Amino acid sequence: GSNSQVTVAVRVRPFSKREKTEKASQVVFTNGEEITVEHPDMKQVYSFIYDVSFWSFDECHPGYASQTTVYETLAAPLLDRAFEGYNTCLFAYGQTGSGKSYTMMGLNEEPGIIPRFCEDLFAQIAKKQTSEVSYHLEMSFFEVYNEKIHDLLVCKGENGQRKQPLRAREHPVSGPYVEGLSMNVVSSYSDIQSWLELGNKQRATAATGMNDKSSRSHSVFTLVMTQTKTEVVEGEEHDHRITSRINLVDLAGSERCSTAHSSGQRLKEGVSINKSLLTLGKVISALSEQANGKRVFIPYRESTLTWLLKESLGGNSKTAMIATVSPAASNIEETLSTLRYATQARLIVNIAKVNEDMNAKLIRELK
C-alpha cells in the first residue's frame, strides 16, 4: 500500500420553508470552487478550499450539482478502487436539515449515492461476468441509537420492545466488528432495493422544529465484494481472491435544544448524537495532527460509531466525506464548524492496500 488522502467534498443545500418564512440572508458564496462566508458582522469573509465544491443552491445557475453529478464525482472512483480490491468509506457530516439523508439515499424520485453505487456496481459486474472471475456480494445495514447497535435488516417481532441490541467486539486482526449481524447475500439491485426499503422503514426517525423527518440514529451500509479469480496453475485453481469492503455512513445532526424544541426521548437521543459527534471531531483533529508528525492518541474507544468505523477514518481504506451546509445566516456557526472539520479532514491520510488474503499461504510470500 501507499499513502492516500481523504477526499473531502462540500454541498450547499437550498433555502427551506423555515429559512424562507423567517426570511434570512444568503451568506454562503462559491468563488468558482472556493467556498466563502460573509459574516453579518462583516469583520471579515472566510474562505475555505476543498478538493470539490458543489452548489445545489440554485436550480438554474451554471454549476448546478445534481445527484447524478455528485455520484459521478465522488462515488464512482470509490467503485473503481473497490474493483481494484481496496476498501472504501464514504461518510456524511453536517447539521440538522443539511441533506445527509438525501445525498446518500435520496427520495424515490431522486435516488442517492447508495442506490446509484449499488446499481452501477452490479451492472459493471454483469458486464464483466466472465468465467475468469466469480463475484459474490454480501451486505449489512446497521444503526447506532443511544450508543446501542441495532440491525435494520431484521424484522421486529410481535411487540414494541423488539430493538434487540447487539454488541461490538474486537477481532485481533480484522479489527472491530458487530456480533450477531445478519449479513445477507446480494444477487442484484432489486434485492438491494427491497432490503434497503425495509431498513429505512425500521430506522429511527422523528419530526422536530428544524425537520419533519430527521434521523435519530447513525446508519452504516456495508458491502463485502469478493472476487475469486481463475488462473492457470499446475494444481488447484481459484486461489486468487480479493475481498473489498464498502462502507457508506449517514450520520445524525448537531441540533441545539432550542430551535428543535424537545423534551424526553427526543432530548436524550439528541444528547447521545451530540456526544458521538464530539468524539468524531476529536478523532478528526487527532488524525490531522498525526499528519503533521506529532505524537497523538486517537480516541476511537470513546464511542461505538468511531469504534466500528476505526479502520475507515484512518486505518486501511480509501476514505471520503461529504459535508452539508445551509446558505442562511441562522446556521452560520454550525456551518463554520462543519467547514473547519471538513478542511482539517483533508490533511488526513490512510494506508490503503489491496486485500489479497494470501498471507502465509503462498502468494503474498511469493510477492
Add this chain to the structure above:
Amino acid sequence: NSQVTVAVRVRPFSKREKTEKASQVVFTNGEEITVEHPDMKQVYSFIYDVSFWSFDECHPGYASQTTVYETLAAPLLDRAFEGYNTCLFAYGQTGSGKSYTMMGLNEEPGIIPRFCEDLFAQIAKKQTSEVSYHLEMSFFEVYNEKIHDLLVCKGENGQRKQPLRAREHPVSGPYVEGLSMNVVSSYSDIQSWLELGNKQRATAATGMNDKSSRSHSVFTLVMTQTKTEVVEGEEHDHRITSRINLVDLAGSERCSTAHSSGQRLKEGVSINKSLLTLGKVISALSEQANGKRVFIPYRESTLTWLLKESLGGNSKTAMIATVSPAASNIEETLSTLRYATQARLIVNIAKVNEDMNAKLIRELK
C-alpha cells in the same frame, strides 16, 4: 540359525464403514506404519519386517493375496522340502480380517489353500520311482490350558469334550497322547476335515461379535520323504520328516471395559496368559538368533510346549498380525501392533504438516 518373520496386514474399509464415513487412523510411509489419533495428540510409529497395505487397490505395492503368500508362507515350503520344520501364527482381533488372509473366500483364496495346493504341486513334480512322499494331518484345539481334538464326532451326551494329555518323548520331543492322525491326498480332503473341525472349535457370542474364537487352533501337516541310496545292495529307507504347523490364535480382550463374569472371564484370562508366554518365547527366540545366551520358556504353556520342536532349532517361524484402519477399533489396533512388535515402539507428536497451502516453507526459503 533361526529367525522370526513378522508381517503386519492392514485391511481396507468395509461397506459398512464406508457408509458411516468411519475415519482413518492407520497410515503408511513405505515400510513404516503409523497411528495418528483423531484428537491430534500423539503419533505412534511401528516398524515390522514386512507390511501388507491392502487399504486401496490403486496404491503401488498393494498387497494381493498372492503377494502375501509368496512373501510370507511359500519359503516355508522350501524349507520343508529341504527338511526343516515350519510354523505360521495368525493373530488379530475380530473384524481385522484374520480369516480372509489365511483361509479365504471361494474366489479370493488365502494362505492355507495356496500353501496346500502348491505343496501338492511340488510333490507331484518331485514324485519319481526313487523318492516318495507321504502326508498326515491333525487338528487340535487348546481351551483353558486343556487339549481337545477337532476331528472326532461328538458322542451322545450333553458334552463330549474329552481332554487329552501332553507327553515328552525323549527323541521326538513333546507330543499329544491319543490324538488321531489321518492321511491326505488332496485339498478336498483337507478342506473337508477343516470344515468339520471349525464347527467344533469353541466359539461364543461375546459383546464384540456373534462368533469370536475362544480356543487356539493348531493344524499340523507331517510330510515324510522316503528316498533310496546305494548301500551295496537294495537301496532302501533314507527317511526325512518335516512338520508344518498353522496356528490360529485368539484375541486378547481386556475384562475391565468388557464387563464379563464366569466362564467368559476364565477363557479370556487363559487366552491372555498363553499369548504372554508366546510373546516371551518369541522374544527369547529373537535374542537367540541375534546371538545371546537365552533360556526359552517352552514349558510355561501348552501351545509353546507342543510347538517346541517347530519354533526352536533349525526351524522357521512366521507371524501375521491383522489390523483394521478405522478409528473405532483403535485400542485393539494399538494393542495388536504392540504385540506384533519385536524391537521397540516409537512415539512423537506432530501437527505441522498442514502448511496452509502447497508447502508454504518453500517460498519462504
